[PDB]
Amino acid sequence: MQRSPLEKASVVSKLFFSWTRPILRKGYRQRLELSDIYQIPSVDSADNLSEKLEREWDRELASKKNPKLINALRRCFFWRFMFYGIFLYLGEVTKAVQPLLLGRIIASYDPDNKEERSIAIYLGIGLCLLFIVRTLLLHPAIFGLHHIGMQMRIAMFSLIYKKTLKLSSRVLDKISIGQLVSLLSNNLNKFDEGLALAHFVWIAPLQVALLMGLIWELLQASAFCGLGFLIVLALFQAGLGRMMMKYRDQRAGKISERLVITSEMIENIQSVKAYCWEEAMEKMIENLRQTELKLTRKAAYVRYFNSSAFFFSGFFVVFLSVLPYALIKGIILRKIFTTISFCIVLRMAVTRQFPWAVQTWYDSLGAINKIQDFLQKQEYKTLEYNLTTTEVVMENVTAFWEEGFGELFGTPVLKDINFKIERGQLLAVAGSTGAGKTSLLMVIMGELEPSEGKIKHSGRISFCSQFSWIMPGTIKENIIFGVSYDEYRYRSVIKACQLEEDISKFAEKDNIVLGEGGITLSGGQRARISLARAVYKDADLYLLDSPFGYLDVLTEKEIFESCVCKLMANKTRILVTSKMEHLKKADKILILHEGSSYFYGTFSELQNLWNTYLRYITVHKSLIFVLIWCLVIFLAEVAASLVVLWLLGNTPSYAVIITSTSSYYVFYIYVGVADTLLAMGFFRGLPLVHTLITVSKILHHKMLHSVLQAPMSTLNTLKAGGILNRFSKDIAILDDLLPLTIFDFIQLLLIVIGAIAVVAVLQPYIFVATVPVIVAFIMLRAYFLQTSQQLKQLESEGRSPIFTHLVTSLKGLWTLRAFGRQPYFETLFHKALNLHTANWFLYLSTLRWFQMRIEMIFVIFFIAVTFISILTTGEGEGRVGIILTLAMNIMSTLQWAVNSSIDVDSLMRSVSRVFKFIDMPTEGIWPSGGQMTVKDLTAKYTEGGNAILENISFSISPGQRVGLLGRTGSGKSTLLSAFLRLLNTEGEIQIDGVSWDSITLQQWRKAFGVIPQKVFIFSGTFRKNLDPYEQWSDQEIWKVADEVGLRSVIEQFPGKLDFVLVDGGCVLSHGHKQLMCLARSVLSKAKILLLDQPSAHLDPVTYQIIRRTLKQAFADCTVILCEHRIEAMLECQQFLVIEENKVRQYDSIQKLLNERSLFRQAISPSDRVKLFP
Ligand SMILES: CC(C)(CO)c1cc2cc(NC(=O)C3(c4ccc5c(c4)OC(F)(F)O5)CC3)c(F)cc2n1C[C@@H](O)CO
Ligand SMILES: Nc1ncnc2c1ncn2[C@@H]1O[C@H](COP(=O)(O)OP(=O)(O)OP(=O)(O)O)[C@@H](O)[C@H]1O
Ligand SMILES: Nc1ncnc2c1ncn2[C@@H]1O[C@H](COP(=O)(O)OP(=O)(O)OP(=O)(O)O)[C@@H](O)[C@H]1O
Ligand SMILES: CC(C)CCC[C@@H](C)[C@H]1CC[C@H]2[C@@H]3CC=C4C[C@@H](O)CC[C@]4(C)[C@H]3CC[C@]12C
Ligand SMILES: CC(C)CCC[C@@H](C)[C@H]1CC[C@H]2[C@@H]3CC=C4C[C@@H](O)CC[C@]4(C)[C@H]3CC[C@]12C
Ligand SMILES: CCCCCCCCCCCCCCCCC
Ligand SMILES: CCCCCCCCCCCCCC
Ligand SMILES: CCCCCCCCCCCC
Ligand SMILES: CCCCCCCCCCCC
Ligand SMILES: CCCCCCCCCCCC
Ligand SMILES: CCCCCCCCCCCC
Ligand SMILES: CCCCCCCCC
Ligand SMILES: CCCCCCCCC
């Protein structure tokens, strides 16, 4: 890409932000292509900012007694912050002194006022220079604040990731994905824009002091009667701001809880559809949203009064200040308007700048102190040797997962374990399910500090987890995992893993871009890729945690005797296996049972013993009625104001002194108080803010409902972080920023329209005088938005790489520390930050260019108007200036209205992106016998893609158990998924004589009982996981738990049937998750059931449970059992062998094994003698 134009630009061009001109010119005619996005400035790269803040934070920890993160920021961002502060203050001083010139010029129109007319010509030049100075002094400061804020946010986001990669093992159970995502999203765009307002904490007191002294000149001692009203208002306003944060802190927990469950269900949406749980998930989320929206409304009601305090202050501040002065001595309209022209600034300084500054300081310091807490949590210690005899030895090791139980010294996970392997002994770990084998490996890696005993080994280690983890990218990226690509070693590993036959089927033959979690791949393909990654890296110790889970006996034997016993014969390798043949070739065998070492020794001695605003308003029927209500009342107030002005001019000592020629001040006075006469009270504001929030409820409900029913092919294209972005950030915008910003835009629009209308009816030339300015505003806005809309979308979509990477890293954290590849993912995360920074910085600069031009055009028109006004005043009664200057006083408010319109349209991008999900396509006693017939079935995942199954035809009888076998990656799960119709299919499969299309899709799916390959467990109670619909009493739940053997594991935890699972059920072992899904299927009594790999890792002793419950509980229902272990084939009668995208049925097992010699020769002897008598 091109270098940033900021590097080499003119100083005059940099001041005016003219370097953003090319992209606006390019972005008006056609769409913005990738070749246009400029590179980030070198002083903005995440690496330099991370290095800087890390160094200061390291020094801060090493020096002070009490470290504070805010202190570390104060040394690397303060000087530029203050340097821009003095320029921002000088911009505000220029604004509070304007009435000394504008009011002195307006008074010159009257012939009776000789004094201020003699010098009016000099004041025109002075006022002209005053406007020009302010334009070059106020905007470049704000952009500097935005630039500093972007640097701070990037530099803090880096340290968040630097700490995340090093978090201790036991703190992960308390820090869920939703906590980080909420932490990032809340500050993702608020922190940068916040710094533009942070300076008014110390600017506003100076503005109040200066203005009060300047008003003291006019109203000698009565000005303080008007100030006391603002002081009471400020105290009341600060009280509401304090109250708002109470409602916002109570909400943080329940929104983080939602963001966890939302991500859990949607990354496993395949299983949710199979279970027909759409309604259950929607109700669960809506119960969480109810309390969240309740707190949002109670916050929004308070924030409305916090916002509207400015508009309902105009008439009162003016009235309460001039009344004690007018009562004692006569007041001239000349001083009434000049007092108004000071209050218009004093009100905004103390009601709209100061409280916003204080609130921003509240928020930013709260976020910094929360990240300071994050940076000081318990950290993974790595105190271990780096050189030794390479002899892995352990002795007297015990461990507890729960910190409190180990602090007291609740069965310990391990007790008194010891072993020793010198330089290549294959130590086969075995035992029953849940006895603890994964924990033994985590103790070795240092993921679980043993309270007692010692463990010694070499530094280099490799790890193949019992649960596969596939990072995004090609197969090659997963295998090498961030090192140099060696051709010879790469081919040898793939050949050893026998991935050649399976990778050859892919279109690109090596490079298929895998989604997060490897959903594109089969169960066994992910397992072998995880194995290949471990094999590729050279290490002293290899921890192979049961890679032979989803593989058939043929591939298991080949991969074991070609990759484990042949490729790495001279490397120590701990292997977790249950097959007896693997213990034969092991030099050491460690049998574990309930954490105790049952046996240790050699096997020999073992044997010896634009249509978006319209649709956003139409989505709710009450919103249009409230808007009409706000318009009807507006017309009444305009009509009342119009007749009041008309009846004062027709009328004729008195307290207020006016002359015939000075009467024109009445209209100038009105413009300064029109904001209060047209202000929306609590009878119009609260209904609008209330109704704008219920729209967000309906939009969220519709969006989640539409997503849950989308076809699977559309769901596989979208990334996990794109979904997480649109649920966290987008919905937060629709609740927090959209309602009140729309209210401000509508309020300002009403004020401008009413002020123009009533003035135009009375003096029908001010409307003509303002048309050339309004048209210029609308024309410039329509030109800028053609590029701002596209820039906003590019930045909005640029947030997804950050969330995908964070989810991927946190899910795979156990593999990262085993390999030691933290720096590789640190620089990869910095690429995502720089990618987001480029679009955000570019958008933020083009917006600043518009803000400068929208003010410059007003300045140009005003300077033009003052000279014609000054020059036209002849021998008294300067009518031309009376009409023109009034026309330009209203545009000082329309400029604010235009800026608010830009903010509304920028935020309306969120609405459109949520609507984009609603439009997604929708894929849309009888089962007495269970007899089904398949005719000419064809299956293919993507439309127009490769046909995984072609013209399949077979039939099964009622009450018949059918086996479904075949080599890994042949199509077994595809065939079982074709029954439920998750992927696009052709043909027909009738049950009991009714066709597919004769019955609705959801009624069809409900006939089946499914056990998916990827066990799904969401955060919640045990009884909620076993039946979300709550249609079973606890008596039946226990009666099933006893039959499936979940008794002992459930009662261990403190809350029996009440324990809240976390991290997708990390507390349970893998074998307990299989039993959990088994109980879930048993409870849902279905006349037909599809079992895809029930006994994934269950040892033969645990398999007795599987065969018992399938024999007893599933008495007469037809079973389609997909299994890999040969012992399971005894039960099923018919066998469906899948190969070459085709299916062929056999009635006897002896014919099946006679056909395939190589299949038969691999069978373990205990199962070979079982099948062959
Ligand atoms: C001079 C003195 C009165 C006493 O030494 C002082 C200076 C000072 C500066 C900062 N913050 C900053 O210079 C930066 C900043 C951080 C966070 C931001 C942000 C700006 O503005 C926001 F509101 F957006 O949050 C630019 C980095 C601060 F926080 C507290 C400070 N104190 C009080 C002292 O007691 C602190 O120890
Ligand atoms: N993170 C954890 N926190 C607390 N308890 C846990 C955790 N992981 C497992 N356990 C519990 O500790 C015991 C053993 O843990 P587990 O990982 O270690 O067995 P395993 O070796 O994976 O079993 P299997 O052979 O069935 O896969 C079980 O009772 C299990 O429920
Ligand atoms: N969503 C998908 N899009 C494209 N191809 C897919 C998709 N899901 C799976 N495949 C491919 O289809 C083939 C078979 O899928 P898969 O269910 O069928 O294997 P399997 O035999 O069920 O696995 P295992 O024996 O490990 O349980 C594989 O080549 C796999 O990569
Ligand atoms: C903190 C800083 C900004 C405070 C500034 C206070 C200034 C604006 C105040 C302080 C004293 C004030 C002056 C006090 C006395 C007089 C004499 C009177 O016949 C005209 C107004 C005039 C000339 C005042 C103008 C405003 C004034 C100069
Ligand atoms: C600058 C001088 C002249 C005027 C006084 C400035 C005001 C705005 C200052 C003085 C004390 C400040 C508060 C001191 C302590 C805290 C707690 C922190 O967790 C959030 C910010 C907060 C709440 C500060 C907000 C701003 C504050 C109220
Ligand atoms: C908070 C607003 C207070 C408004 C009332 C101001 C005080 C009363 C003003 C009139 C005082 C008249 C005094 C006449 C004295 C004759 C010797
Ligand atoms: C919104 C309040 C409007 C008040 C209008 C008062 C009108 C008074 C008319 C007096 C007419 C006198 C004719 C001699
Ligand atoms: C830097 C701030 C200077 C403020 C000077 C204010 C002067 C107000 C006019 C006093 C004489 C009428
Ligand atoms: C930056 C401050 C500028 C103040 C200008 C005040 C000019 C007052 C002139 C009065 C002449 C009668
Ligand atoms: C008698 C002549 C008075 C001239 C007043 C000039 C005021 C200049 C103000 C400049 C502000 C930047
Ligand atoms: C004088 C420097 C600018 C004003 C900054 C005041 C902020 C005080 C915050 C105190 C936090 C403990
Ligand atoms: C905070 C307001 C200060 C006003 C000072 C007025 C001094 C007049 C001599
Ligand atoms: C910008 C054009 C203003 C024209 C004003 C005409 C006033 C006639 C009395």
Ligand SMILES: [Mg+2]
């Ligand atoms: Mg395990």
Ligand SMILES: [Mg+2]
């Ligand atoms: Mg499968």
